[PDB]
Design a protein around this nucleic acid. Structure first.
Lengths: 56, 49
RNA sequence: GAGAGG
DNA sequence: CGATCCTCTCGAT
């Protein structure tokens, strides 16, 4: 669909960053963090993106 | 008054099992909500839905 | 995750 | 890519 779906859109150029209500925090002890897997993976993709930006 | 029927009666070894009403009764009319889903919490111990 | 209940 | 439902308790990360 010319409007809603193109095959060029099946490849990622700009990835949508989910807000905190999707990947919330809060632990059992109020001295440490306690982040969501989704947040840890997004940090992981960023580490991979800045690395690529550096090397280039 | 005598019962028309005679009853089979005598001692029999019975066991008191765990699983007691009072450890099972649970009711919730609004209460704690889960963080992510914003849906009721799970279990009697947590006042769950 | 296991142990259990109907 | 499927593999009952719901319910409880426990211990451990």
């Amino acid at each position: 669909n010319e409007v809603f779906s193109r095959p060029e859109w099946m490849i990622l150029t700009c990835l949508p960053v989910p807000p905190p209500p999707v990947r919330p925090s809060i632990s059992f002890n109020e001295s440490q963090r306690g982040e969501d897997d989704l947040t840890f993976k997004l940090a992981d993709i960023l580490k991979a993106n800045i690395s690529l930006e550096t090397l280039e | 008054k005598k019962l028309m029927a005679q009853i089979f009666f005598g001692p029999t070894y019975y066991q008191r099992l765990r699983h007691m009403v009072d450890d099972k009764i649970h009711a919730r009319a609004r209460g704690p909500m889960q963080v992510l889903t914003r849906q009721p919490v799970e279990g009697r111990s947590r006042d769950g839905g």
